[PDB]
Design a protein. Structure first.
Lengths: 348, 248, 248, 348
């Protein structure tokens, strides 16, 4: 649906040069990198508030680079959900309708349901909380039922307490509306968790593009590696969850961790290199997790020594340079990657 | 210490203004209360007031019609002459009253730029439209600067938000921007109306005669001295305070 | 679309003001350039200008001496009558020029509150101090509001910081607060000086005669018509822009 | 020097009720808890910008509660060092002098040296960086040479890169000037590292008071425990530092960690409960640290299980509830607390 063709625009602090991208229908595409000034504008230019200097913008396959916002026929939700303060929620929802001259009150009561706002339909925008506002936002933004949903920093600015749900709400709309979402964030963790693809843009420059796994487990030199280097995030599926203690599955191994999640939940487990150990044997410690596998590469660093181990699951371990010598740097030594269970943070 | 001195000087200013406008009313409602009662019926007076409020209400509708958009413009865009255009609008509050009259005459006067070529349609000098134009030139800035800060108040995003929901710029401006900046436009209009009502020098030169409230008071003052003078100035203020206060 | 209409109306206002004050000069430097050359030497004129600048410079030193502290006060404290005291200071820009004259007369007039009991020391009506007081009442607000925002600009902490370093409030205000708010006081003083120079109605009633620039132009206008009238109004502006521009 | 006697003041958002404290001469006292609005005011009231409603304030033993700032004869450095922008550094330093009518240019050139500002003495306040400004601040604030130095959030708002030095600079002035410092922060870690005593104040209410060790290893119920519960911070002394790898001493045990520090450095080692393991034996892992000791208490929590172990050094370990059952909750079981060295963060 969304195609940026050789785009370029120049402002007083942000420079966009030769940007080409293709977000295919229904795909949840995520741009990663830019900070505020950039993000918000790049998206505005897409939405048609800024005509480029050179290049094209093709939504649903229509050259809109020189049209107007009302004509781009999109859904746009700023980070600070720009709700109209002189209209009770409902009136807001309505707006989009009255604007394109439509009739159906079903679409409105149904859209209101889809976002669980029925109970707020009457309140005034300022008495609503972040999410409450954000929902109402998505609500009216999606009443005209477009296919393309442009969102900017919808997550990073909420209480962690809502982020989990928030993410769902979105993932849900992504499908039940068969939306083609363009998500711009500076939070790589958010990026992973919700992308179908990531488009790394640094200082208004496209640098890499591709499925999550391809961006982190295979960065491009310097810039990209520096931005996401050495971090263990395992996409897994909870197999058992007896009494707060989860057992998640990644590839062919099993990981013990903690958190309230039900079996069948596609979750994410974060594990820092400094919480993984390496023994030439697994003893019975308080350590729930202990995986076999060999060493892949040994990145002698400063005082520490990065190590990539293959335990059915790529793991980035970190070690004191000295232990790295008492043991073997041999790229292929049998190894036991053991990490404490209570140090594995799980997200959904 | 310092707080004291400063506070004294302040109390001063306060009294200075307060006592002056007070005192003036004191006199009237003291040595000749009746004078007011006379003025109240005196057509010369009522005609001079209703005229002021009238000419004013008009100049304001022009100010509204010009200052408003000049504000929306000035609060969203940035061109090369923003500085200049921005100053010309500001100026009219430093152009000595008289000067403004003369200058205005030079244009709307029977022998001026716009007044000469328009003898058949409308006359300006010593007529209503003459005082209207005078007022506008002196009170317009208020409704402008005030309508700018009004629009400035409503941040862009809301306009952009409406736009992407399918609303053309004017529908945006009309259903959102405007209604939200109302409180500012309302005040500015009224501030205008009052800078108009109270304009003398500027108007006198162009159209001294349909005798506008403030001029009248001067006419009487020279001719019939301070006695038939004060009663009109007191009657005028009470009208300013009734308007100013029924709204601020 | 909307941008256009709005931009047209704006261009209008711009021309409206610009053309008016321009045109007026055009005439002079066109049909009778000499008239200026005459005015330039004419004592009646020079005396009326030097007077304005003079009376003004004075009213400003009073404004400075009163508005300044009224600002420091208003920008740091919160008492019960802040609203009132704050409005009285604001008012003088809506008190119709004439009215202000009458009212002022009622106090500084030979038969008024302060004028009566002070016949032996100083006379006000038709004298310099009469025009001075008039100006002040009309221009003072500017140096006040401007000196408030000035002081408001300099945040408290700096004063507190100086205090704890061993500096008494005034030493604080003098060595810190003041110097830092200068840029604001300077502008405000000059804005004042110019609201003064250009005051007519207000002054005429109290002291029409030592003929202040703006009054003169009116005198000539009725008597000797628009010819000996314009040349003075043009000569006056050039002085306003000279001042206004040698500083803004 | 500083004594608050039954203090109480009421503002629109902060309430101070019955506050009593005694900071003895030369002691570096630290108030902990309040957030912005509070901190800054409590300190201002001390400095004499706010007269209380009830109570007294006695500096150097002088009842100043009703005097003026200039008379309190203190040193005050706001978080945002309020330097005077219309005076080159030097002129600032001078100010205090000219104010109390003093002569010595030695005090000034010497004070300027003490804070390493000689080279900036001429520049204008706005071209200076945080520290540069902060120094200049402390400089003029301490030229009148008072004994009492009131500081507020001097640390938490700096690049970590300066914090280390920053802390020194201060500790140094504390002694070389024989200062009695009253330090207010919301950073407990800062509090520890530099306090001679902590005064816990929550929502303008004094709750506890006492040496660091007493505040964290012995909280008062609920409020305090919740504010600083389960965190391993070991005050130690670096015994060896060969090639970036430190060996620090705590009580009677030795801990391996990493960082650039020289032998003899009193340092701090942070260790999270989720990075400590427990075995009924020490194997040779890539684990540098492995300490003996028994279990003290077992706090069965949600899915996890807190455990206090005594290995010559009190350690707070965290465990999956399940491992806690496969092993023994017995309060006294012999144990091996082993934690990875590269997970021990050290500060100075």
């Amino acid at each position: 649906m969304i195609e940026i063709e050789s785009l370029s625009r120049k402002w007083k602090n942000f420079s966009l040069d030769n940007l080409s991208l293709k977000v295919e229908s229904g795909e949840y595409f995520v741009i990663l990198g830019p900070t505020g000034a950039g993000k918000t504008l790049f998206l505005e230019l897409i939405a048609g508030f800024h005509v480029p200097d050179s290049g094209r913008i093709l939504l649903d396959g229509k050259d809109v680079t020189d049209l107007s916002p009302e004509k781009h026929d999109i859904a746009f939700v700023y980070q600070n959900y720009s709700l109209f303060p002189h209209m009770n929620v409902k009136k807001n929802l309505e707006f989009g309708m009255r604007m394109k001259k439509i009739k159906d009150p079903k679409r409105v009561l149904d859209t209101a349901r889809d976002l669980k706002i029925e109970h707020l339909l009457d309140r005034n925008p300022l008495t609503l909380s972040g999410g409450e506002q954000q929902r109402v936002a998505l609500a009216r933004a999606l009443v005209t039922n477009p296919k393309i949903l442009l969102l900017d920093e919808p997550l990073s600015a909420l209480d962690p307490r809502t982020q989990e749900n928030a993410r769902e709400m979105l993932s849900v709309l992504h499908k039940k509306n068969k939306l083609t979402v363009l998500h711009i964030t500076h939070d790589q963790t958010e990026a992973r968790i919700m992308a179908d693809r990531i488009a790394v843009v640094m200082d208004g420059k496209l640098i890499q593009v591709g499925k999550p796994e391809e961006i982190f487990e295979k960065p491009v030199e310097g810039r990209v590696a520096s931005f996401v280097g050495f971090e263990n995030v395992l996409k897994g599926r909870v197999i058992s969850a007896e009494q707060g203690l989860l057992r998640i599955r990644v590839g062919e191994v099993v990981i013990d961790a903690a958190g309230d999640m039900e079996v069948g939940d596609q979750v994410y487990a974060f594990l820092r290199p400094e919480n993984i150990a390496l023994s030439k044997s697994s003893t019975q410690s308080s350590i729930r997790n202990s995986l076999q596998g060999r060493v892949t590469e040994a990145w002698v660093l400063g005082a520490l020594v990065r190590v990539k181990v293959d335990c059915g699951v790529p793991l980035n371990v970190l070690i004191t340079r000295r232990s790295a010598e008492e043991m073997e740097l041999s790229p292929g030594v049998q190894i036991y990657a053991r990490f404490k269970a209570s140090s594995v943070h799980v997200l959904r | 210490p310092l707080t004291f001195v400063f506070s004294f000087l302040l109390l001063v200013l306060f009294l200075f203004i307060f006592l002056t406008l007070s005192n003036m009313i004191f006199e009237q409602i003291t040595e000749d209360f009746s004078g007011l009662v006379k003025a109240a019926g005196n057509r010369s007076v009522i005609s001079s007031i209703f005229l002021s409020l009238y000419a004013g209400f008009l100049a304001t509708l022009l100010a509204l019609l010009l200052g408003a958009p000049t504000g929306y413009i000035l609060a969203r865009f940035d061109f090369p002459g923003k500085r200049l255009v921005e100053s010309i609008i500001d100026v009219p509050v430093v152009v000595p009253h008289t000067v403004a009259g003369i200058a205005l005459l030079t244009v709307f006067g029977s022998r001026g730029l716009i007044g000469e070529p328009l003898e058949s349609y409308i006359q300006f000098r010593d007529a209503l439209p003459g005082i209207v134009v005078a007022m506008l030139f002196v009170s317009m800035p208020y409704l402008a600067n005030s309508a700018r800060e009004g629009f400035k108040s409503v941040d862009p995003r809301l306009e952009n938000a409406a736009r992407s929901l399918g609303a053309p710029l004017w529908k945006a401006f009309f259903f959102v921007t405007l209604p939200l900046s109302a409180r500012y436009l309302l005040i500015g209009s009224v501030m205008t109306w009052a800078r108009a009502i109270s304009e003398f020098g500027a108007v006198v030169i162009l159209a001294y005669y349909p005798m506008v409230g403030p001029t009248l008071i001067y006419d009487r003052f020279i001719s019939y001295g301070l006695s038939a003078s004060r009663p009109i100035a007191v009657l005028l203020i009470l009208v300013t305070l009734s308007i100013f206060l029924v709204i601020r």
